[PDB]
Amino acid sequence: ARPLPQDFETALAELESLVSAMENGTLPLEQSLSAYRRGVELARVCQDRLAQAEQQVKVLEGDLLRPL
């Protein structure tokens, strides 16, 4: 099975692309279930990367204010 991207931008781009394929009404039942499993994994990667980024900004905000 295909390796799963771990960076936000690639994961997001595959997720968008999986969604369109899902909505164009041409994926057989079985491919639709694969696309679903795949997209859950991709969305999880996107959210993990965003949580990391949120945390990094918070830490920077704290660091900015600390000297004041």
Next chain:
Amino acid sequence: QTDARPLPQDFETALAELESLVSAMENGTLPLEQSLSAYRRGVELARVCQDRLAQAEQQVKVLEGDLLRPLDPAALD
């Protein structure tokens, strides 16, 4: 007083500028007036970052919802 240079509106550049202000603040060489100017720029920069993250998070949540929609059978009572 206020830093009048245009404000980045993209996550990467705002984050990068934010890191440089933090570096400048935690060098202590900053007189008070410049610290406060650096702080306000800082808050504006962090706000761009937090806005873009919030939007990306919402975009991902919408995409998740769109993925699940075609797998919904017709509603029962």
